[PDB]
Coordinates of all heavy atoms in Angstrom, one line a residue:
Chain B
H104 N 19.2 45.6 40.8 CA 20.0 46.4 41.7 C 19.1 47.3 42.5 O 18.1 47.9 41.9 CB 21.1 47.1 41.0 CG 21.8 46.4 40.0 ND1 22.0 45.0 40.1 CD2 22.4 46.7 38.9 CE1 22.7 44.6 39.1 NE2 23.0 45.6 38.4
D174 N 23.8 38.4 15.9 CA 24.8 37.9 15.0 C 24.3 37.4 13.6 O 24.8 37.6 12.6 CB 25.7 36.8 15.6 CG 26.2 37.3 17.0 OD1 27.1 38.2 17.0 OD2 25.8 36.7 18.0
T200 N -4.4 53.0 50.6 CA -4.8 53.4 51.9 C -3.5 53.5 52.7 O -2.9 52.5 53.0 CB -5.8 52.4 52.5 OG1 -7.0 52.5 51.9 CG2 -6.0 52.8 54.0
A260 N -10.5 37.4 -5.5 CA -10.3 37.6 -4.1 C -9.2 38.6 -3.8 O -9.3 39.5 -3.0 CB -10.1 36.3 -3.3
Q298 N -25.6 35.8 -11.1 CA -27.0 35.3 -11.0 C -27.9 36.0 -12.0 O -29.0 36.5 -11.6 CB -27.5 35.4 -9.5 CG -27.5 34.1 -8.7 CD -28.0 34.3 -7.3 OE1 -28.4 35.4 -7.0 NE2 -28.0 33.2 -6.6
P467 N -5.4 51.6 4.0 CA -5.0 50.2 4.0 C -3.6 50.0 3.5 O -3.1 50.8 2.7 CB -6.1 49.6 3.1 CG -7.2 50.5 3.1 CD -6.6 51.8 3.2
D485 N 7.0 26.3 -7.9 CA 5.6 25.9 -7.5 C 5.4 26.2 -6.1 O 6.2 25.9 -5.2 CB 5.4 24.4 -7.8 CG 4.7 24.1 -9.1 OD1 4.9 24.8 -10.1 OD2 3.8 23.2 -9.1
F545 N 13.7 53.6 8.4 CA 13.1 54.8 9.0 C 14.2 55.8 9.2 O 15.4 55.5 9.3 CB 12.4 54.5 10.3 CG 11.0 53.9 10.1 CD1 10.9 52.5 10.0 CD2 9.9 54.7 10.1 CE1 9.7 52.0 9.8 CE2 8.7 54.2 10.0 CZ 8.6 52.8 9.8
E668 N 12.1 43.7 -4.0 CA 12.2 42.2 -4.1 C 12.6 41.8 -5.4 O 13.4 40.9 -5.6 CB 10.8 41.6 -3.7 CG 10.4 42.0 -2.3 CD 9.3 43.1 -2.3 OE1 8.9 43.6 -3.4 OE2 8.8 43.4 -1.2
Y751 N 0.7 47.0 -20.4 CA 0.8 48.5 -20.2 C 2.1 48.8 -19.5 O 2.2 49.2 -18.3 CB -0.4 48.9 -19.3 CG -0.9 50.3 -19.6 CD1 -1.0 50.7 -20.9 CD2 -1.2 51.2 -18.6 CE1 -1.4 52.0 -21.2 CE2 -1.6 52.5 -18.9 CZ -1.8 52.9 -20.2 OH -2.2 54.2 -20.5
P760 N 15.0 56.8 -22.5 CA 15.0 55.6 -21.6 C 14.4 56.0 -20.3 O 14.4 57.2 -19.8 CB 16.4 55.2 -21.5 CG 17.2 56.5 -21.7 CD 16.4 57.3 -22.7
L1015 N -8.9 42.1 -44.3 CA -8.2 41.0 -43.8 C -9.1 40.1 -42.9 O -9.4 40.6 -41.8 CB -6.9 41.4 -43.1 CG -5.7 41.8 -43.9 CD1 -4.8 42.7 -43.1 CD2 -5.0 40.6 -44.4
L1083 N 23.2 28.4 -25.0 CA 22.9 27.9 -26.3 C 23.9 26.8 -26.7 O 25.1 27.0 -26.5 CB 22.8 29.0 -27.3 CG 21.5 29.8 -27.4 CD1 21.2 30.3 -28.8 CD2 20.3 28.9 -26.9
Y1166 N 12.1 27.0 -47.4 CA 12.9 28.0 -47.9 C 12.3 28.7 -49.2 O 12.5 29.9 -49.3 CB 14.3 27.5 -48.1 CG 15.2 27.7 -46.9 CD1 14.6 27.8 -45.6 CD2 16.6 27.7 -47.0 CE1 15.4 27.9 -44.5 CE2 17.4 27.8 -45.8 CZ 16.8 27.9 -44.6 OH 17.5 28.0 -43.5

Side-chain angles (χ1 to χ4, degrees):
Chain B
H104 314 329
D174 308 291
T200 293
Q298 260 180 0
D485 259 38
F545 280 84
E668 300 104 357
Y751 214 44
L1015 281 159
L1083 277 206
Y1166 271 21

